[PDB]
């Protein structure tokens, strides 16, 4: 027929707060979304720390070299004159 | 006037493989002393003796050798 | 004598994957390099600027720079005049030409000491064992005039003296100046002159290793979280 | 290959012999004119002298 | 009111190529290597941007400019060793991409494969032609050996090698020539990769199983961009392990002297992605046969569209064609070791036997292997 | 692979899929993963393994035979 | 012995473990795609179900258990009376093109 | 010449020349499989000549695979440890030969028992060659 | 309610607050990772870096 | 953008690298200039939607 089909058991795949069918959802959906979004935020803060690091390495590479910073600094006034 | 690191001499008087390399090296020394105007020499046996000597004083004597 | 000897894996202070060099031994190696090896060998790509931040203070590096009279140009009347060195100039070449270096060292060129450890296979263990390998030659091996035998140089004929022994320098840091200590000090100093980025390199490697250890299972969990729809996708087939 | 070998394809290849051979001489004469070969340009009497 | 990713035309081609491209769901980690080659080409381009800003191209101070980058330029050592080990990362991703292409039945994407081997020729040319540019003894003598082996052809050989040299040997015009070529070539490699993606997107991607994947399709976003990010993070793990821990391990230590034409290294050796090329060139005793074996060795995997005698597409359901493919990559590893070894009896007979067996696998034994697959599975 | 709607003409096939947020991200990662890696390596280690030990035998043969011949 | 070697080759090919018979793992050429147009509808439908289930199984990198593997004696050669007709029609078309 | 061929195993020390070593123990496993399959044919007769030749080929191939995997893993452990006078280098090879035995007879418990028994047999063989008192002694008392 | 449930109910629901917490975590995490990794790098290398010798051998 | 206290060697090599790389950015921008042109069409001197008279 048309309602012969039932969705099978996902009990070997379901997360630990949504195993029970006697309890309802929207009581641990905040936790089960906030865990994966904490993983999303900490993955994105790893990507953001790498992006704030490597672009700063490249910007300090476009900045002045140690030979030029050693050459341009020597305004030694002395005490001879 | 201080002494150098004599753990090369301590290794080669403590280990059997170093005096085996020493005895085959002096056998080749007597061979090239008996044979005059020869092309063979003691280079490969002194190479193996130096390799065993420096490998042991690198890998098992490290309390002063860096 | 076309065979070359591989140097043994010496247990250095920086041979480990996360251990930097001994900066005190870098200072000792620069001191005994300036004593005995800098009068013949010529390095060029290192300077007195690079010693500060690693082994010396700025006043100590200025006092090391001012003791050498290096050549600049030109004098205002139109000639060449001498000045004391500063931190900006590079190292004093003791031979002004490579052909003058070969004519002073009998036809043997002293190579560029700034890149020896990266330049040679085996690393600084070769540079330690070449200086500590000055043994007597075996019989059946005869050499030239003024030429001494090493087992570590390819070709088995160095163009050198036996340059270091016990009491080369009255050593200012209090360590005894034996030959293995002096050769270890110039080997880690030439490793520093070859790779001055060793401390920052393994520091950035530590940041990278802790960052990938705290980032890669999160990215793997994000791949599994965005792919767990397909991992839990079960099909069916119901024809009528 | 096996479908391309036949009497009709041999007759089509015979029909396409002179224009493809003339295009091959076009490519050869153009390669000679582009590279200026000293063996070949010294045989043409209009460029006989030194160029 | 309207969708921007199907209305705006740059966003339309970005959405069609990147967002909801119909891709098969069953592709493995070996399918990530094409986008890994794209981001590795982009990181080679951006490290070359930040590397050529302090690089002076002339033989008096090319090596002095390289040491000025590695010492006096702030974070210049990271850029130069990241560029060299990212060339190594680029070639190991290219070798795993072409191993996936030889494995998983994707010979038959014919124009994709032909513009791929044109791209592979350009990548190898720009890799050697940028390996000259540090101007060491090994780089100069490798330039002399590789360009001198192109002089084996009569009547065009010495004209070609003074054309590619600008003199009797490698000199200042040769180094500035190779630096201009090393600038211009990866951008035409990137445009060739863009039209390689266009020739892919004509007919979609393929599965590991060699089947028509039109029944089961997932969008590329967000199912494959997070696998792209995971592949990018593991590729950056191995690349940053290569730059920050073992910088000269995959490189040659003999390059780090100043270049001198008056002496020769005791064995002359090109880079690790050119070692099988140098072993195939060293296998043939005739020099013209060696350079013809070079060109035929790079070009002979473009004949693999024409060497598909089997009615099954992939090698997933071909068990002794898998045996011949793994003995092909074993021959490639033996070729890499033989090219790393110098020219001595008996490395030459091992290189000769391994090059003969590699050409017998890529030409003879694998089409008759596909014939005996379809004979053992009763197709005819 | 032209577009995402006119590709196939399939019929009578039903696909159930759960959420990313209603299920575990690592569902039995060890007890169903290490038998799966063991089954995949059991399927392909007899095809990927003996060419590489031929490579290692040729490598040790070449190194010890070159060091024997260079005496 | 030849049937035992063919069954060992069927086990070593791997698509009996994965859920496909002999005629699903064909290269989709123009002859095979003409036969794809020329199957009946039920054979086409469970063939594309078997290809979709095989793509699901090689996405999950796992196979079915041994009780529901496609046996060599349970293999049917459904595409072969269509593919042989397409091959002989293409052969007579190329012979008429040679004529 | 068979015994002079088979005594090339011992005068070359472990850690070097793995190809000749695995050829010697592959030939030893093939000879022991030939005599074990000859005993299996003369104990249980096959129903066909094709079944008997498949039985002797299968037993010779499995015992040659046991000997080849034993000597290959013994020399691979000798390469990775560089200890030629070590019975653990024969323990790993005997366990790999027993695992090859149990993989060929398709039972993991038999693989574990073959690992334990063939590993202690190879360890007793290498340590009996190390001390030197013979398995087959001359009568001396 | 647990701590990711309160974090989603007050903090992770809005995407601008999500990016705000990502950037605030970057601002704290740069200094925290620099301090922790420099503490690890000078804990495993006592007496070898310049910071353990500049306090006593600078003059 | 100077790389130092004045216009110098690093400024000249950096401007060499930028001057080499920027026309390929101009070429890719010309490709997307053609791509944004080819859906909206091309103008005429009369200034009309001229889809009736097109060659
Ligand atoms: C007489 C001047 C002189 C002195 C003093 C000297 N060297 Fe040398 N050195 C040379 C020459 C000349 C060569 C190369 C030719 C040869 O092999 O004889 C050389 C070779 C070397 C090499 C080998 C590089 C290679 O590529 O093989 C190293 C390393 C080296 N010296 C370091 C040192 C160190 C460290 C010292 C200080 C203990 C030192 N040298 C003392 C002149 C000198
Ligand atoms: C080095 C630059 C290269 C880049 C950037 C590149 C890029 C890509 C991309 C993006 C894909 C699609 C995979 C995906 O996104 O999931 C792909 C697939 C493909 N590429 Fe490349 N490719 C490169 C080199 C090559 C070469 C040299 C060849 C020829 C041997 C080649 C042949 C193929 C083939 C046949 C496919 C289709 C099969 C598959 O998806 O794996 N590619 N490439
Ligand atoms: C268009 C982008 C690129 C630019 C501008 C560029 C520029 C440079 C420059 C200036 C150098 C010399 C500095 C040095 O010694 O490392 C160099 C070296 C090199 N490049 Fe590139 N490059 C580019 C892309 C690539 C690519 C795609 C590859 C890989 C095939 C590559 C491989 C190399 C190699 C192997 C070296 C030598 C590294 C060494 O020995 O130091 N480059 N490149």
Automatic annotation (TrEMBL), chain G:
It is a peripheral membrane protein. Coiled coil: none annotated. One of its GO terms (molecular function) is protein-containing complex binding. Pfam families: UCR_14kD. InterPro entries: QCR7, QCR7_sf. One of its GO terms (cellular component) is mitochondrial inner membrane. Component of the ubiquinol-cytochrome c oxidoreductase, a multisubunit transmembrane complex that is part of the mitochondrial electron transport chain which drives oxidative phosphorylation. Component of the ubiquinol-cytochrome c oxidoreductase (cytochrome b-c1 complex, complex III, CIII), a multisubunit enzyme composed of 11 subunits. The complex is composed of 3 respiratory subunits cytochrome b, cytochrome c1 and Rieske protein UQCRFS1, 2 core protein subunits UQCRC1/QCR1 and UQCRC2/QCR2, and 6 low-molecular weight protein subunits UQCRH/QCR6, UQCRB/QCR7, UQCRQ/QCR8, UQCR10/QCR9, UQCR11/QCR10 and subunit 9, the cleavage product of Rieske protein UQCRFS1. This is Cytochrome b-c1 complex subunit 7. The gene is Uqcrb.
UniProtKB/TrEMBL annotation, chain H:
Keywords: Membrane, Mitochondrion, Mitochondrion inner membrane, Transmembrane, Transmembrane helix. The keyword Disulfide bond does not apply. One of its GO terms (biological process) is mitochondrial electron transport, NADH to ubiquinone. It is found in: Mitochondrion inner membrane. Transmembrane segments: none annotated. Complex I is composed of 45 different subunits. Belongs to the complex I NDUFA11 subunit family. This is NADH dehydrogenase [ubiquinone] 1 alpha subcomplex subunit 11. It comes from Mus musculus. The gene is Ndufa11.
């Amino acid at each position: 027929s048309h309602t012969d089909v039932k969705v099978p058991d996902f009990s070997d795949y379901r997360r630990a707060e949504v195993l029970d069918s006697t309890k309802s959802s929207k009581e641990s959906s905040e936790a089960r979304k906030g865990f994966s979004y904490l993983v999303t935020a900490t993955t994105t803060v790893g990507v953001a720390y790498a992006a704030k690091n490597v672009v700063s390495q490249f910007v300090s590479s476009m900045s002045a070299s140690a030979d030029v910073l050693a050459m341009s600094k020597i305004e030694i006034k002395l005490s001879d004159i | 006037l201080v002494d150098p690191l004599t753990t090369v001499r301590e290794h080669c008087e403590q280990l059997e493989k170093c005096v085996k390399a020493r005895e085959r090296l002096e056998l080749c020394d007597n061979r090239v002393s008996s044979r005059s105007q020869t092309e063979e020499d003691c280079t490969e046996e002194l190479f193996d003796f130096l390799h065993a000597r420096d490998h042991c004083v690198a890998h098992k004597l490290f309390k002063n050798l860096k | 004598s076309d065979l070359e000897l591989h140097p043994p894996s010496y247990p250095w202070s920086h041979r480990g994957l996360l251990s930097s060099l001994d900066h005190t031994s870098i200072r000792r190696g620069f001191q005994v390099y300036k004593q005995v090896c800098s009068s013949c060998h010529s390095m060029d790509y290192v300077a007195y600027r690079h010693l500060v931040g690693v082994c010396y203070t700025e006043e100590e590096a200025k006092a090391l720079a001012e003791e050498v009279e290096v050549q600049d140009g030109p004098n205002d009347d139109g000639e060449m005049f001498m000045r004391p060195g500063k931190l900006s100039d590079y190292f004093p070449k003791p031979y002004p030409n490579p052909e003058a270096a070969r004519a002073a060292n009998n036809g043997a060129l002293p190579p560029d000491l700034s890149y020896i450890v990266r330049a040679r296979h085996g690393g600084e263990d070769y540079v330690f064992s070449l200086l500590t390998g000055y043994c007597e030659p075996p019989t059946g091996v005869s050499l030239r005039e003024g030429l001494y035998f090493n087992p570590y140089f390819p070709g088995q004929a160095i163009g050198m003296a036996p340059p270091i022994y016990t009491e080369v320098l009255e050593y200012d840091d209090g360590t005894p100046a034996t030959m293995s200590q002096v050769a270890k000090d110039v080997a880690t100093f030439l490793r520093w002159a070859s790779e001055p980025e060793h401390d920052h390199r393994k520091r950035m490697g530590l940041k990278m290793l802790l960052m990938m250890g705290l980032l890669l299972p999160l990215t793997y969990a994000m791949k599994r979280h965005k792919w767990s729809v397909l991992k839990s996708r079960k099909l069916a087939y119901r024809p009528p | 290959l096996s479908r391309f070998l036949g009497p009709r394809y041999r007759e089509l290849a015979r029909n396409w012999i002179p224009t493809a051979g003339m295009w091959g001489t076009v490519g050869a004469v153009g390669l000679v004119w582009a590279t200026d070969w000293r063996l070949i340009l010294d045989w043409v009497p209009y460029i006989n002298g030194k160029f | 009111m309207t969708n921007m990713r199907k209305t705006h035309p740059l966003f339309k081609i970005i959405n069609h190529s990147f967002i909801d491209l119909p891709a098969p769901s069953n592709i493995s980690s070996w399918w990530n290597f094409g986008s890994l080659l794209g981001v590795c080409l982009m990181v080679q381009i951006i490290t070359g941007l930040f590397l050529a800003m302090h690089y002076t191209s002339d033989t008096m101070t090319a090596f002095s400019s390289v040491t000025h980058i590695c010492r006096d330029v702030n974070y210049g050592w990271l850029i130069r060793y990241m560029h060299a080990n990212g060339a190594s990362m680029f070639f190991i991703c290219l070798f795993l991409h072409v191993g996936r292409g030889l494995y998983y039945g994707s010979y038959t994407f014919m124009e994709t494969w032909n513009i791929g081997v044109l791209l592979l020729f350009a990548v190898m040319a720009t890799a050697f032609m940028g390996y000259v540019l540090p101007w060491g003894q090994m780089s100069f003598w490798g330039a002399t050996v590789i360009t001198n082996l192109l002089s084996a052809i009569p009547y065009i050989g010495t004209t070609l090698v003074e054309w590619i040299w600008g003199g009797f040997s490698v000199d200042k015009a040769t180094l500035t020539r190779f630096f201009a070529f090393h600038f211009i070539l990866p951008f035409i490699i990137a445009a060739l990769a863009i039209v390689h993606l266009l020739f892919l997107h004509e007919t979609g991607s393929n599965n590991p199983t060699g089947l028509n994947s039109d029944a089961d399709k997932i969008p590329f976003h967000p199912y494959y961009t997070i696998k792209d990010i995971l592949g990018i993070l593991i590729m950056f793990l191995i690349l940053m392990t290569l730059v920050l821990f073992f910088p000269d391990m995959l490189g040659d230590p003999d390059n780090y002297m100043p270049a001198n034409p008056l002496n020769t290294p005791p064995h002359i050796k090109p880079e690790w992605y050119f070692l099988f090329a140098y072993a195939i060139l060293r296998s043939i005793p005739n020099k013209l046969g060696g350079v013809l074996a070079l060109i035929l060795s790079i070009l002979i995997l473009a004949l693999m569209p024409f060497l598909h005698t089997s009615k099954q597409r992939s090698l997933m359901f071909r068990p002794i064609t898998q045996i011949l493919y793994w003995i092909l990559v074993a021959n490639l590893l033996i070729l890499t070791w033989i090219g790393g070894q110098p020219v001595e009896h008996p490395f030459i007979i091992i290189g000769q036997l391994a090059s003969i067996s590699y050409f017998s696998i890529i030409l003879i034994l694998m089409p008759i292997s596909g014939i005996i697959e379809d004979k053992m599975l009763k197709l005819y | 692979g032209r577009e995402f709607g006119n590709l196939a003409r399939i019929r009578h096939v039903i696909s159930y899929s759960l959420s990313p947020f209603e299920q575990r991200a690592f569902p039995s990662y060890f007890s169903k993963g290490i038998p799966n890696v063991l089954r995949r390596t059991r399927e392909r280690i007899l095809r990927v393994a003996p060419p590489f030990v031929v490579v290692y035998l040729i490598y040790t043969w070449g190194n010890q035979e070159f060091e024997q011949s260079k005496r | 012995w030849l049937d035992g070697f063919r069954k060992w080759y069927y086990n070593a090919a791997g698509f009996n473990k994965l859920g496909l018979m002999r005629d699903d793992t064909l290269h989709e050429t123009e002859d095979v795609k003409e036969a794809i147009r020329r199957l009946p509808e039920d054979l086409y439908n469970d063939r594309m179900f078997r290809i979709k289930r095989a793509l699901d199984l090689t996405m999950r990198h796992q196979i079915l258990p041994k009780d529901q593997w496609t046996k060599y004696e349970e293999d049917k050669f459904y595409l072969e009376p269509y593919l042989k007709e397409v091959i002989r029609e293409r052969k007579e078309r190329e012979e008429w093109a040679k004529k | 010449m068979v015994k002079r061929f088979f005594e090339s195993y011992h005068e070359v020390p472990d850690g070097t020349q793995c190809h000749r070593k695995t050829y010697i123990t592959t030939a030893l496993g093939g000879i022991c499989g030939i005599i074990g399959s000859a005993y299996s044919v003369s104990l249980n007769p096959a129903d066909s000549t094709l079944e008997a030749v498949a039985r002797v080929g299968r037993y010779t191939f499995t015992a040659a695979a046991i000997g080849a995997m034993f000597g290959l893993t013994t020399c691979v452990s000798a390469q990775v440890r560089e200890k030629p006078d070590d019975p653990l280098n024969y323990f790993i090879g005997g366990c790999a030969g027993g695992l090859t035995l149990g993989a060929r007879t398709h039972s993991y418990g038999t693989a574990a028992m073959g690992c334990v028994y063939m590993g202690t047999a190879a360890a007793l063989f290498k340590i009996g060659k190390l001390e030197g008192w013979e398995l087959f002694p001359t009568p001396k008392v | 309610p647990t701590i990711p449930s309160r974090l989603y109910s007050l903090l992770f629901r809005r995407t601008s607050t999500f990016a705000l917490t990502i950037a605030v975590g970057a601002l704290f995490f740069e200094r925290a990772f620099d301090q922790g990794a420099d503490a690890i790098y000078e804990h495993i290398n006592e007496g070898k870096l310049w910071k353990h010798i500049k306090h006593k051998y600078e003059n």
